Write a protein that binds this ligand. Structure first.
Ligand code: ADP
Ligand code: ADP
Lengths: 333, 11, 12, 333, 12
C-alpha cells in the first residue's frame, strides 16, 4: 500500500533489483521513475486545483499518482532528456534541457515526504572543501591540503610536504593518439613541478600523500555501517609467501570492522550533513592512523553489497525507505 | 523568461 | 595552452 | 575589525556601492571578490596544514585572509572564468570550467561563518514547485498551476481554467539573426491548443490568469520588509508581464504597506526557508486578493532601494551583514 | 522541431 518513488536510469536495473525485492517483502510498492526517459518516454504533471495538489507520472509500464508517496529515493541523475537532441533544433537545445532539468529537479525538491537524496543536498555535497572542513571539525584526521590556482602557493606547499598528490575535484578524459587517456591522482614529481605555472588557468587540489597500509570504503545507510578494506600491507607480504600463490583476494575488498571512535565520527558526519546515505573513503597509514578522504553522497554500493550475505546493504536501504529503520527525518514540514 | 529584473545569481 | 591537470593524463 | 566577504563581479558596483559604504560606516572591512577575474586575474588558495586552516584571496594589489571573516554575502557570481576560453586549448576548456566552478562554489559552500546566500540554498530555491507548495501550506493564495510535459493534462487544465498564462521556470536567451529573443509570461490562446504537441519535448508551467489590480515586489532583509507597488495594466505591453515594459516602469514603482497577515506570512516563508534575504513577487487582483507568485532568493533590490530615502534597503543589508540586526543564524558548527 | 515556448518568443 505504501508507495516508494525511486529515481534511476534505464541502464541501472541491478543494484535496484535487490532493494526492490526487499521493499516488496517489506510490504510496500515501488514506483520506478527512470530519469533518462524524461521527458520523451515518461510524462510527469503536478497540478494545484481547488486547493488540492496532485502529481501523476505516466510510464510505458505503469501509470501512478505521486502526491501521496511515503518516501522518495533519488539516486543522483547524470543523464536526463535522452533523445531530445535529435528531436529539437540546435538553437533550442540548451534552453530546453535547462527547463527540463529545472522542472524535474524542482519536482524532486518539492517532495515533502522523507527523502533519501535531493538536488540541493547533492549540490551541497559537491563542495569537497566543506567535506574536509567538517571532517576536521568532527575530529577526523585529514591530509594536509591546498586547493589553489596560485603557482607559488602550490610550490611552497609541495616543497614543504615533499610527497604530494594532485587531484581534480572533477575528472577528465579524452581519446587521443588512438587511445583513451584519463586523468589520475598522481604524485607531483620534478617533471610535473615544471608545469606548475599553468595552475593560473585552472585550480587543483594538492594533498600530502598518505602511505597506504589499508584502504577503506564505508557505506552508511541510516545508522547501519558497512566497512570494507583492502590490506595493501598484508597483500604485499603474502606475495612473498609461496603458500599464498594463486590466492589473489589481495585485489578484493573484504568486510571489516571499524574502531568504535571512527564509526562514531562517521555517524556524526552523517548527522552533521543530515543525510541517511553516505560512501566514505579512508586511508589507514603505516602508523595505523585513520585519514578521511571524502564522502560521496551518490556512491555506488552494489559491488560491495555483493560481498555481504544476501545483500545486507540493499536490505538496509529497503528498511530505511519503508520506515523500518531509524532515520534522520528530513520531511519538509 | 526575462532579466530586466535579473534575479538569477548565476551568469 | 594547457591546464595543470593535463599533465596527469595517463594511458587508460 | 570584522571582515565581510562580498561575492560579486566587476559589472555589479550598481548594487553593492551603497552596501559597502554603509558597512564601512558600520566599522567593518569589505573584501570584494570579483569572480570574473577568477582564476585569471586573482588567486584563491585554501590550505589545511599543521592543524590550521587558511584562505587567501590575492589580487594584484592586496592579499586578503578569508579564514577569519565574520560574514559572506553571496550576491552575484556572473561570468566566472572570463578570459580562460582564449587562453586554454579548446580540448580542455569544458573540463577546466567545470573544475573552476566546482572549486569556487565549493569554497562558497564551505564558509562556516554566517552566510547571506549559499549555492545549496539558492539551488533549493530554484524549485518553483516547492515555493508554491510551501506558500500554499503557509496560507498564501496561489494561482491554479499545472507544470507538465503532458499535452492532454495541459489541455484539461486549459479548458477547466479558461484564462491561462504560460511560463518558463528558467531564464534563457535564444539567438536568431544576432538578436536575443526571450519568452515572457503570455496568455494561452484558447484556440491555439493544437501545437501543444510540442509539449512532449520540453515541459512548461501553466497558471490561471490573475487579473492585476496591482503588482507587488516585497524585498525582505532579515526581518525588515520593504513593499513596493506598480500598476501594470496601463501599458498594453506590460499587461501580462510588467518586465516586458520594465525599463519604462522601472521608476513608476510606489512604496506600499502590506496587510499584517500578508507580512506575517512572508516572514514565515523566510523562516521556513531559513534565509535572511528574499524578493517576493505578488499580484493583487481587483477583488483585493493577494496572490503569491514567486520568491527570488537572490533578487535585485537596487532599483527599489533607490526609490527609498538614502538607500534604506542597502542600509538594512549592511546592518544584517555587520551583525547589527537579528539574523536567522546559519553558521555551520 | 520547435519546443512549445518557441511560439511565445519575441525580441526583448
Ligand atoms: N592524500 C592522499 N594520499 C595518498 N593517496 C591518496 C590521497 N588522496 C587520494 N589518494 C588516492 O588517490 C586515488 C584517487 O582515485 P582516482 O584517481 O579517482 O581512481 P579511482 O577511479 O580508482 O578512484 C584513490 O585511490 C586514493 O587512494
Ligand atoms: N498566474 C499569473 N497570472 C497573471 N500574470 C502572471 C502570472 N504569473 C506570472 N505573471 C506575470 O509574469 C511575470 C513573471 O512571472 P514569473 O515567471 O513568476 O517571474 P520570473 O519569470 O521573473 O521568475 C510577473 O511579473 C507577473 O506579472
Amino acid at each position: 500500500m505504501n508507495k516508494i518513488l525511486i529515481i534511476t536510469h534505464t541502464a541501472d536495473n541491478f543494484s535496484i533489483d535487490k532493494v526492490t525485492e526487499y521493499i516488496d517483502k517489506n510490504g510496500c510498492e515501488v514506483i520506478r521513475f527512470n530519469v533518462d526517459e524524461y521527458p520523451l518516454k515518461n510524462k510527469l504533471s503536478t497540478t494545484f486545483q481547488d486547493g488540492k495538489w496532485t502529481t501523476t507520472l505516466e510510464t510505458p509500464e505503469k501509470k501512478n499518482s505521486l502526491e501521496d508517496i511515503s518516501t522518495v529515493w533519488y539516486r543522483r541523475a547524470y543523464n536526463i532528456g535522452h533523445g531530445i537532441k535529435e528531436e529539437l533544433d540546435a538553437k533550442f537545445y540548451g534552453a530546453a534541457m535547462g527547463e527540463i532539468r529545472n522542472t524535474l529537479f524542482g519536482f524532486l525538491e518539492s517532495i515533502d515526504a522523507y527523502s533519501l537524496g535531493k538536488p540541493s543536498v547533492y549540490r551541497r555535497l559537491d563542495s569537497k572543501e566543506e567535506q574536509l572542513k567538517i571532517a576536521d571539525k568532527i575530529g577526523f584526521k585529514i591530509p594536509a591540503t591546498c586547493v589553489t590556482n596560485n603557482p607559488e602557493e602550490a610550490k611552497r606547499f609541495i616543497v614543504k610536504h615533499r610527497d604530494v598528490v594532485a587531484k581534480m575535484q572533477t575528472g577528465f578524459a579524452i581519446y587521443e593518439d588512438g587511445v583513451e587517456n584519463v586523468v589520475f591522482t598522481n604524485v607531483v614529481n620534478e617533471d610535473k613541478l615544471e608545469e606548475l605555472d599553468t595552475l593560473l588557468y585552472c585550480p587543483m587540489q594538492f594533498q600530502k600523500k598518505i602511505e597506504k597500509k589499508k584502504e577503506l570504503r564505508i557505506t552508511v545507510v541510516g545508522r547501519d555501517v558497512y566497512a570494507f578494506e583492502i590490506d595493501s600491507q598484508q597483500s604485499e607480504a603474502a606475495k612473498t609467501d609461496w603458500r599464498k600463490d594463486g590466492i589473489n583476494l589481495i585485489d578484493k575488498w573484504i568486510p571489516t570492522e571499524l574502531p568504535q571512535d571512527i564509526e562514531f565520527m562517521i555517524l556524526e558526519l552523517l548527522d552533521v550533513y543530515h543525510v541517511d546515505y553516505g560512501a566514505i573513503d579512508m586511508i589507514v597509514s603505516p602508523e595505523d592512523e585513520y585519514y578521511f578522504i571524502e564522502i560521496n553522497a551518490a556512491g555506488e554500493f552494489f559491488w560491495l553489497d555483493n560481498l555481504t550475505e544476501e545483500n545486507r546493504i540493499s536490505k538496509s536501504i529497503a528498511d530505511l525507505l519503508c520506515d523500518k529503520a531509524p532515520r534522520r527525518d528530513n520531511r519538509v514540514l | 523568461t526575462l532579466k530586466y529584473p535579473s534575479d538569477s545569481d548565476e551568469g | 595552452k594547457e591546464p595543470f591537470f593535463a599533465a596527469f593524463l595517463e594511458k587508460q
